[PDB]
Amino acid sequence: PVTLANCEDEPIHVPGAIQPHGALVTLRADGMVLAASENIQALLGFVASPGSYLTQEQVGPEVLRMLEEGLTGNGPWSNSVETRIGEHLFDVIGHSYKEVFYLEFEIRTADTLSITSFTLNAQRIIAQVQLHNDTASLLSNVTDELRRMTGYDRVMAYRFRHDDSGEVVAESRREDLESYLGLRYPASDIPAQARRLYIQNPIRLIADVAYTPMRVFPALNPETNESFDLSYSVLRSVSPIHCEYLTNMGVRASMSISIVVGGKLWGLFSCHHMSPKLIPYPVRMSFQIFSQVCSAIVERLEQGRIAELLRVSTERRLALARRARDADDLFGALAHPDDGIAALIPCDGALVMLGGRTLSIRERQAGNVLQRLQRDPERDIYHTDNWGDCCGVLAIRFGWIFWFRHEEVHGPSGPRLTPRGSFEAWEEVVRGHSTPWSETDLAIAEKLRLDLMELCL
């Protein structure tokens, strides 16, 4: 059973059930059926029974042909074919994962996307990704054009911050609907397995959120004694918790393009529609490759950006050391506040103590902080938050130096599963926390302390 105590650790990769707008058949390395969704009979003619091998008179030759390329091919298998199976026309989408071949049969609604039509869906959106250098403009434009293409009632862009939280930084919507721009949610809203998954699969599609699921039996794969890993499964079922959530939001369909940098989920477009919605495989695949393209683009953009700040920041420090290694009045040289310490690390106020002289840029607290480093009389550095009249504190020793950051930063069945009810849960994590001290800030204060450890007279 699934609750708020239990959402942190839920195995959404091996649910043992899909969604009903398709069917699933799992087969082993020799094509023998190991398991099938329970609507196979309802969607198609056959009764896929463990032990059986698929036959032309069940699934068509196109599928068998396809599946064969798979069983004899060597590496990971991915492929599809547009086959008529008796009731309807189908997109049969296969892959192998672990030591299992999945054959997901999703429903087609005509007609064939020309290869060409497919190439300019891709090229149309990609094109929107390469007009801009700013990362914000980039997100803002794609968010827009995605909606034009999909028709989704709402297209959104989320950024993820080092602390694994989330912000909505772009939007294009139906105006009947509330705006989300600026909203903030915690890491806890996307459990490690959702996340680790959004990285693995560029795209997710949820078609009906109040869909009532469809199980695969057996729930457990005889060959391996473990359940089936539907990680790469298209129709893989959605967790119930996130379903209670989207319903509290009044949303019936979902769709997510991923944006990945380093080995990490850096952001993601999440499309919403207020009635059920299905984006056909071929078109998903467009946006699949878009996701590959967008991710690289952002990586280089963001490394260039960061490298810059990193340089102006280091170029500052060095400027300051050369200005002191060559300057007397180390206090006054540290001090034309504009050349000052507070100009090196992002803070709200800072402090330069040495000898019996102080200056509170942007004195008394200094005899209290040195009095809390009384029990660690050999610390040359100090870093904390959540604390006088400031919670963010970073301290270096050579005389000392301090930088400060305050913190004025900024139905259902369960409580917190709501847009504003997640933002409220957020505030708590942040009401006693200043902007944390980047890897960089620890390096700067560090290189600085050393730099001033060179000065002799």
Add this chain to the structure above:
Amino acid sequence: PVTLANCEDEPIHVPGAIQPHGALVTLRADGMVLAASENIQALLGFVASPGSYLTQEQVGPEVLRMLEEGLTGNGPWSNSVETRIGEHLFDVIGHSYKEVFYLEFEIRTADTLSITSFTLNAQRIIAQVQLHNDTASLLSNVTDELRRMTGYDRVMAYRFRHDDSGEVVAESRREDLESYLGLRYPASDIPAQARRLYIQNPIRLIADVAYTPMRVFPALNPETNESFDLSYSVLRSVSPIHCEYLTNMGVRASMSISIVVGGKLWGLFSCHHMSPKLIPYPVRMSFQIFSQVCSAIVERLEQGRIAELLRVSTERRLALARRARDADDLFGALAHPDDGIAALIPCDGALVMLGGRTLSIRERQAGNVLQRLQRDPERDIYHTDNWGDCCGVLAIRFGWIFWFRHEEVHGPSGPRLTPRGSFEAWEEVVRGHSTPWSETDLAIAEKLRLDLMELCL
């Protein structure tokens, strides 16, 4: 008739013919046949005749359905369909240009490419473009991964200097064949029309070089009284001049992927084959989009690179001005080989002159040159090639400054058309010529002279 005098003016966009590995039908905006290749009957079993309208019984319903969505469309029409006609299965590629509908029939000789397989070609190759942050690692890698994909037996990469000349900066070949790296050709080797084109069309495919062409009739479009524009036409016809060339090279097939920065041809991968070869539409359409991605990835890398040189460069001047303006010894500040003016513009030698005192860093050519501008006694700036013993000369007045570049830089049926033969007619135009003075170099000397216009004492 086409000669070496007639190479640069040849209209290769309006040949009135195509390659024979397919057939072409043109139609006015209402479907009526305006012209067709002289090989339709042979290939297809129709006699597409001006005045006719195509009918299901010759072209299949699939085409007509396509064509109709074109006629009743609004914008630039592009699309295609994999129909079977009487003898063969076909890739039928259509587009509208000017006010005409081209229907090109290219013989299909494979199994269908799954939308999935297609996407992995796209993604495989794209992944290559995104591994590297260096522009040369980039070319080198993709240049390789392309051959693995296509199987072409020689695939090269070309960069294009500002004078629109060429240079093979990467390669991957069948060992039996001579290597090409470092090779250089003139602008003349690619006339502004072929270049205009490669910019318009990501991809060109030459199927057989000694192909003996197939004409379209009438040669001239009655509606317009002009010839048909076959840019954007896939089966368009190759110039004979370039055909003689590839043959003098012992090359039978071709294919090129464009790389475009600014509105300009920045480089392009060219694929060669010592025997006939033919990439299918759909695959070409993977590389089409690849080309789009690759072009962008390159544009941003190069603007970053250049944005950087341009900064280290400017930061230099500024450094230099503050050193001169803030010391009394200018000669000593302006000629310190490290604070050197020689450090500002990329040269082989330089010179500082003011009063009766000079210094030849890295002097006689100067006596002649200050004698040249004797007939122009109100110039404050000078620049030239191809000229004593140094040909590159740039001079600024304040008191004078000079920068120098010597230029030690570095069968058939027609005279020149050959690899080592275009390089021979490349040299004779560059020998007198020193590395030309960049747009950037004229801005640096100018800024400098102005900066020094500043010093009062």
